């Protein structure tokens, strides 16, 4: 499917919820919203890093230790 580039807000968040490696929700007025991130899609790559199969905490660590600009590929 597709590749979405987002920018962390002033709280360090791009604006989505996930569980089991899949995006379940998008936050109103967020970079995920503005950039067209879609729910019910599995996350494949974050900043060039394959996250298929990683635990949610490992994904969350990648996202939290990423810089301001976060690019995610989804399927």
């Amino acid at each position: 499917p597709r590749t979405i580039t987002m920018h962390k807000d002033s709280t360090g968040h791009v604006g989505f919820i996930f569980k089991n490696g899949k995006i379940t929700s998008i936050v109103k007025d967020s970079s995920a919203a503005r950039n067209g991130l879609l729910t019910e899609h599995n996350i494949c790559e974050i900043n060039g890093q394959n996250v298929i199969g990683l635990k949610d905490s490992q994904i969350a660590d990648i996202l939290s230790t990423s810089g301001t600009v976060v690019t995610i590929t989804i399927m």
Partner: peptide, 5 residues
């Protein structure tokens, strides 16, 4: 156990 990013 959902995560916010």
């Amino acid at each position: 156990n959902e995560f916010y990013a």
